[PDB]
Each structure stands twice: as structure tokens, then as C-alpha cells.
């Protein structure tokens, strides 16, 4: 995951602003702040995901 993050973050658009690069397709994705909810503690504190 961190390799795909580094590729799409640091080397992707310098690769894409060069000559003749018409399209790209990257395996993986960047980092994103994933927030994994637990339904048991949501039931505990009377909260919904909304």
C-alpha cells in the first residue's frame, strides 16, 4: 500500500506531465484516513454512522 501511495503521490504527475504520456493506470491507490467503525460501541453510545 505504501509503495502505491508513494508512486501516486511523488512520481505520478511528474510522470504524467512529460511528453507523450496520454493516459495512466496505477495499481493500488493513495493513502486515505480510513475510519473503521465498530457497531457494538455505536450501539453502546446510542450513535449512528450519520
Amino acid at each position: 500500500e505504501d509503495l502505491s501511495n508513494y508512486i501516486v503521490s511523488n512520481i505520478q504527475d511528474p510522470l504524467s506531465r512529460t511528453k507523450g504520456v496520454g493516459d495512466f493506470q496505477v495499481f493500488g491507490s493513495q493513502y486515505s484516513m480510513r475510519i473503521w467503525l465498530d457497531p457494538a460501541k455505536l450501539n453502546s453510545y446510542q450513535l449512528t454512522p450519520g
Partner: protein, 52 residues
């Protein structure tokens, strides 16, 4: 009170990508390598590393 705790200086430990704060430990043969830190608290200007 935690017995045999180890405190690290403030800017001696820094975080890289995906969080995961690390500190550059120095080997016995004068080599250097960065180790991960399980820092959970700061006392004054010193991080409390539990293990690592």
C-alpha cells in the same frame, strides 16, 4: 508509577509515512538504523516509549 521507563527527547523521534513514529538508533558497530516507536504519551518534552 511506571518502573524502569525510558524517555526519548522531543524532536529526536519523528514520524514518517502512515504515522509510525521512528527514531534513528545507532548500532554497536557505529551503524545507524531507524526503529519504530510505540509512543503513547509525552511527559514535559520527552516521549514515553513503551517498547522498540
Amino acid at each position: 508509577v511506571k518502573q524502569k521507563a525510558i524517555l526519548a527527547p522531543q524532536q529526536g523521534v519523528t514520524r514518517d509515512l502512515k504515522g509510525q513514529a521512528t527514531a534513528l538508533v545507532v548500532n554497536a558497530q557505529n551503524k545507524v538504523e531507524l526503529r519504530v516507536i510505540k509512543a503513547d504519551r509525552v511527559i514535559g518534552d520527552k516521549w514515553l516509549v513503551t517498547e522498540g
